[PDB]
Design a protein around this ligand. Sequence first.
Ligand SMILES: O[C@@H]1[C@@H](O)[C@H](O[C@@H]2CO[C@@H](O[C@@H]3CO[C@@H](O)[C@H](O)[C@H]3O)[C@H](O)[C@H]2O)OC[C@H]1O
Length: 190
Amino acid sequence: STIQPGTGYNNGYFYSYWNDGHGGVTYTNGPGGQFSVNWSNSGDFVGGKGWQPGTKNKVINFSGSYNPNGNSYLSVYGWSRNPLIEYYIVENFGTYNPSTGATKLGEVTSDGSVYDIYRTQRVNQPSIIGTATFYQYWSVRRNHRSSGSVNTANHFNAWAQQGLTLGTMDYQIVAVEGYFSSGSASITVS
Ligand SMILES: O[C@@H]1[C@@H](O)[C@H](O[C@@H]2CO[C@@H](O[C@@H]3CO[C@@H](O)[C@H](O)[C@H]3O)[C@H](O)[C@H]2O)OC[C@H]1O
């Protein structure tokens, strides 16, 4: 069903839904690995379904519809702890490339596309441990898609070759993000 921001497990899938307190977003958990997001003149939000804890070698499958009108992205999204790391494997995005401002670290080929990899430091920003400072890693698919399989190990290994030390895995989801935009998405994870 439709829920306010929070975390939990639904039909065997972890979910996380976060927003900045601005209105305009409706997040709904559905059967199995399915979730939907519908948004209209939102603020900043990110939510979806997957695993808690994730793993460093998961092959993540997703399918469904992704129709943003503005700034948004569809990604494999997760965290590690000790050290604290936020990471995104971006499969599709809307009007803004979310790696803008991050430092390019190279390229990796995975699951049918080249990806550009990046990192940036986030300073005194929201996180799974509260306000914190942490590196944020990106891997941005060149050939955008809304269904596919992601071999996370290829991305983790590419980042590691440029200095990522992944700590203890925390959640790991397929997420829809929006940033002052509108859209809809209906995604099934497995
Ligand atoms: O109540 C606390 C939650 O609000 C907190 O949630 C996390 C806060 O950070 C969220 O981060 C996304 C960090 O980066 C941008 O990439 C996202 O836009 C931030 O908002 C994250 O998605 C939430 O899980 O967890 C700790 C709780 O105590």
